[PDB]
Amino acid sequence: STGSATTTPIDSLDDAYITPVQIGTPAQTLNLDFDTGSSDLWVFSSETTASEVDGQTIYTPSKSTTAKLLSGATWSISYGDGSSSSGDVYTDTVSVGGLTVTGQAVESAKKVSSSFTEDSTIDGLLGLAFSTLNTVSPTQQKTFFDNAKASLDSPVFTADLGYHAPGTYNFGFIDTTAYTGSITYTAVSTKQGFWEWTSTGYAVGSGTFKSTSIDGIADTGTTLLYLPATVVSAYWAQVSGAKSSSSVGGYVFPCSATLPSFTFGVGSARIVIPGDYIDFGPISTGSSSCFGGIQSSAGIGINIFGDVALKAAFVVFNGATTPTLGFASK
């Protein structure tokens, strides 16, 4: 089997991407944030505290003939940005782009934090990291990809995020028409539950590539690119008027600036992030100061190859017995 679904930016900055997911019988279609940095599939629902729902489409398990309550099960998650959610647990039939998993754990939110309530476009998350991070208790549950794996033509999914445009998540096959040149594969460590890999270095604009190991995670659920302070300083030093602002919360630059590209290494291959991808717009409405898309990971505890980096590539998440990551230009 295979599946193929279009993923769409939620706003004009590509702050996140949503992908339609069919849950239950008859299908209830919710738009979920596919997140390769977490491992819970959770949804706004008929059980979510009413005052914490603001425009989202909700899953109503009592209207699904295939929903089953996982007796006594609970879940509770906190994300790197400080957001959180919690609730109880159902299993139900879940389909993504034609690919169906029966008995998928669907985590129903009873409570969500303000940042989720305030985002009317995101009806929940679909986690695609390793199932060892799943937060269901007393028994951890498997991700959609883990459940689907044995049925897939090949044990892979791919992320092909668009810049200010729709993209694609594919399951079970590599679309050889979706990238230029070849895919370079690189080792993954699953020790922390993430798609964790080591980049071979970086370049700023037309600068000579610096060979240096940068351990980080491929995380479709994080907007920006977070890298060591040394690397990030070297980047913004090439932008006139750029500075790190403690009040804004990161590097900012004059909106009139021409941003250099940023290159990261994948083995001996190179992925080039165009300068425009690094522009996340006015720091507030009407401001002539803009927020940068490359920020320091200092304080996070890990480097994160988020959407800013991933949308510059066709990315293979290879869930073979020994997982790997593949990157191609496109």
Strand partners, 20: 31
From the candidates 35, 119, 160, 279, give the one annotated as an active-site residue: 35
Asked whether the beta carbons of 43 and 59 are under 8 A apart, the reply is yes
Q: Compute the distance between CA of residue 46 and CA of residue 38 in angstroms, rounded to an integer.
A: 23
Q: Are 197 and 188 in contact (CB under 8 A)?
A: yes
Q: How far is CA 270 from CA 149, 188, 210, 313, 326, in A?
A: 29, 18, 12, 10, 12
For 101, phi then psi, to 5°, come to -115, 125
Three-class SS state of 150? helix
Query: Entry resolution in angstroms?
Result: 1.6
> What is d(CA 149, CA 154) in angstroms, rounded to the nearest whole number?
8
- Dump the DSSP string for 3-30: EEEEEEESSTT---EEEEEEETTTTEEE
Residue 4 designated active-site = no
Q: Give the burial string for 300-323 (b: 16+ CB within 10 Å, else e).
A: eeebbbbbbbbbbbbbbbbbeeeb
DSSP string, 159-190: EE--SSS-EEEEES---TTSSSS-PEEEE-B-
Output the CATH code of domain 175-330: 2.40.70.10
**Same topology between domain 5-174 and domain 175-330:** yes
Catalytic residue among 199, 261, 296, 297: 199
Report the half-sphere exposure of 101 (CA within 13 A, side-chain side).
24
DSSP E strand stretches across 220-305: 225-227, 243-245, 250-254, 262-266, 269-273, 279-282, 289-292, 294-296, 303-305
Q: How far apart are CA 84 and CA 30, in angstroms?
A: 19
- Give the Cα separation of 66 and 274 in Å (integer): 46
Instruction: Kindly state the tokens that stand for 236.
Output: 């913004």
Of 7, 195, 172, 40, the residue nearest 100 (C-alpha): 172
Task: Pick the closest to residue 175 from 155, 160, 195, 188 (CA basis).
Answer: 160
Q: Contact at 8 Å (CB) between 94 and 41?
A: yes
Contact indicator for 282, 274 with CB cutoff of 8 Å? no
Cα distance between residue 7 and residue 20, in whole Å:
8
Domain boundaries, given as residue ranges, for the chain: 5-174, 175-330
Fold of 5-174: Cathepsin D, subunit A; domain 1 (2.40.70)
Chain breaks in the chain (C to N over 2.5 A) after: none
Q: Is 214 exposed, middle or buried (0-12, 13-18, 19+ CB in 10 A)?
A: buried
- How many Å is the Cα radius of gyration of the chain? 20
Q: What whole-number distance in Å separates Cα of residue 212 and Cα of residue 138?
A: 42
CA 281 from chain centre, in angstroms, equals 20
Q: 């398990």: which residue's tokens?
A: 61
Residue 149 CA, chain-centre distance (Å), reads 19
Copy the structure tokens of residue 32: 């979920």
CA gap 293, 252 in Å, rounded? 9
User: How far, in Å, CA of 234 to CA of 215, rounded?
Assistant: 18
Structure tokens at 286: 């009407």
Tokens 């609730």 sit on residue: 87
Catalytic status, residue 119: no
Q: Residue length, the chain?
A: 330
State how far the Cα of 280 lies from the Cα of 300, in Å rounded to an integer.
Answer: 20
